Amino acid sequence: MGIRITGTGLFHPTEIISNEELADSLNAYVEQYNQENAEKIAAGELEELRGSSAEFIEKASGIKRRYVIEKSGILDPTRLRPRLSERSNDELSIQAEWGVIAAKQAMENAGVTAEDIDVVILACSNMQRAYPAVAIEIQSALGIQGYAYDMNVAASAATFGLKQAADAIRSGARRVLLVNVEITSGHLDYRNRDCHFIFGDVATASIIEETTTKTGFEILDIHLFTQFSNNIRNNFGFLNRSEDAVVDDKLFRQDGRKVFKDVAPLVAKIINAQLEKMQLTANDIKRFWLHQANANMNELILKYVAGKDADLSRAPIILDEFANTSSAGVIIALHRTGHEVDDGEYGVISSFGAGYSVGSIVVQKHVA
Amino acid sequence: GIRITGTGLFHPTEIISNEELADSLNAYVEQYNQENAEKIAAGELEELRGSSAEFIEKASGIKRRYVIEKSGILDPTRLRPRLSERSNDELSIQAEWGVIAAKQAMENAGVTAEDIDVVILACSNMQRAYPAVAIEIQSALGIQGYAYDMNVAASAATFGLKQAADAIRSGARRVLLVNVEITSGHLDYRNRDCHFIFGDVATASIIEETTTKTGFEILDIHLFTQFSNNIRNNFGFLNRSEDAVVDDKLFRQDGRKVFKDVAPLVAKIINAQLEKMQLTANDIKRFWLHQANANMNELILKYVAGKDADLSRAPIILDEFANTSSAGVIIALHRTGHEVDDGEYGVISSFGAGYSVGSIVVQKHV
Ligand SMILES: CCCCCCCC(=O)SCCNC(=O)CCNC(=O)[C@H](O)C(C)(C)COP(=O)(O)OP(=O)(O)OC[C@H]1O[C@@H](n2cnc3c(N)ncnc32)[C@H](O)[C@@H]1OP(=O)(O)O
């Protein structure tokens, strides 16, 4: 009671990569690969590589384009990763820089300042370093006093973070700043036509406070769920060096088929049980802010929740423009469309993805 | 009514002593200074200095430490454990250690997988980004509910306890909190300044809503962070895209700056916390402090509890384990918690990288 999301903030890099640009880049690296290894392809010693097309990506997912930290390196067939430069310890890290920009916007939108925040949580799928925590770096650049920590549960990091924010407020925090910084172009495999299009880069932020006097989305119910799966996995980590690792699995890897069939009914079951628990029907939900990876999966989830007459008219899509931004996607959607909910109406925020993790949150808008 | 009701501890088998560690580093430096005698006389590469086991012990109180794999750390040509990649079908090393510790803590609390709602992995370094290894631990124990990874380096256990407590206040019955610290994967064994500081370990804790189980009731928590670059490791998933070359992808610290900054800070936090609780230092039977440096702990004790305070009020396990980062306070509480009788007070207090400090006032119940 009285715990509300009172502000959100969005930052994305300026450069954009269209599906067509992405497919042309992959197709060049494929052509080049199949040439240099024409021999061992004929002997079966090496796998022939397949390409893709803008049309396949868009029908596969709904994605048309994405923002990226740096465009030329990702598209260069001889690199296929952003062109970045080490910063010194004296300057803001990349992850902390993006986080600060999104955070400042959430704070202005909530009408709060640095002295009003007690907790900073950096919740996302990959931290730029292990220590000092990037959340502490964000906290300091913003001049916030209190404490901060980094939290990783990949696709549901934002809903899990909202829960942790609610718990900390319930026990005494005044206001929590929750930050999601996803530089997915840093761990994506741009050589793989099945995953190279899925992800884009972004940072989002949220202000969560105890209040009855500020406009926001009041949290009514949270359900969090994990169930270990290896269908999404990235084995990059600090022990690779000691393992003298050689397996080529240190980037995002996935069995998209299995993920689709496992997670869609799982998410739907969680949402339906949550709605029944709250004595609401699908028809009482003004907006579903679902994970933003695959428009076809979301459409199927609403069929399981709101009948086979279902439909995305109340389930906004931002993945056409952002692609999949992992933990940040639900927050992007809420940022862009929360204004379409009226005073007193209900919405549902639901993350789902790697780990298998699922976070589902029932909110109600209040206007002060 | 929320209590820490069990703790568990796993350490690997092999022991490395100050002597072996100094000989191994001394052999590297003699060998490095041998191949580069030119550029050290021609002022291009610096002439490496060695270390002494006598220095290590008096600087910190550390004598030995457990390690995941001994031979590769001591090998002056490698200076890092010899591990092998496991396939996804196998339990990861970090999950394996956390499971072993978790079962012991579950046993000591009289609890089964059924009884647990949340699993938190809270340590200084995660083996991988996704799927969370806390989820891997959760599934290996058969626990149902949710799990997540959380990193605040040295204070990850006190921060995790706060998070466990807050989750119970919101509806969780029981939380399993795990701290797995394979520091040999990110310690710099070439660096005389820090190669002796860290050991490997895993700890676990059960936190429950209860008034009828023996354990430590959590009474007050003060968490604090303040960005400092005085402890930093720049390894990360963007190094590949930065085409990184700076030799800072391992543990680095300015230990004496850390000492001056953090020691008075910890004592100010504890004193204010005691005042808030309307306790005095005399009311605290055991201070479970971060297990990094015995001199630092000695100074913090004699500042909060006065000169003449018995040093047995601040138990030390860093002599056997070296610095274990987030797990240090949990080891100490595990090994000397029985030393606190019913109705007596304790203080758990971790501190370190990030500058993080976390401090918890507890009371024993039997
Ligand atoms: C694995 C990472 C997990 C991530 C978790 C990170 C969070 C944490 O747990 S933080 C833990 C790190 N440390 C702390 O919290 C406490 C901070 N302070 C310390 O640890 C101590 O200062 C410690 C043990 C490093 C050294 O203590 P101290 O005696 O003050 O060393 P220092 O003053 O720097 O050295 C002075 C002299 O000794 C020399 N010296 C330094 N190292 C050595 C050595 N190995 N052998 C011989 N001499 C040495 C110095 O070069 C110098 O030489 P001289 O003055 O004669 O020219």
Side-chain angles (χ1 to χ4, degrees), chain B residues 174-194:
Chain B
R174 297 184 190 79
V175 177
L176 165 67
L177 173 74
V178 193
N179 327 98
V180 183
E181 288 288 358
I182 317 166
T183 62
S184 52
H186 49 120
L187 190 48
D188 187 357
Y189 288 109
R190 302 161 309 167
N191 192 326
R192 147 191 195 270
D193 287 329
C194 67

Side-chain angles (χ1 to χ4, degrees), chain A residues 79 86 139 187 226 244 250, chain B residues 85 130 138 225 245 249:
Chain A
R79 189 180 167 92
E86 290 194 79
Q139 176 210 15
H187 64 135
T226 54
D244 305 300
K250 307 312 191 279
Chain B
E85 270 178 296
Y130 42 97
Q138 176 209 22
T225 59
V245 297
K249 273 74 203 169

Side-chain angles (χ1 to χ4, degrees), chain B residues 289 293-303 311:
Chain B
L289 302 179
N293 188 288
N295 293 85
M296 193 170 183
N297 294 0
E298 276 181 31
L299 165 66
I300 301 177
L301 181 66
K302 286 187 165 178
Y303 189 98
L311 292 203

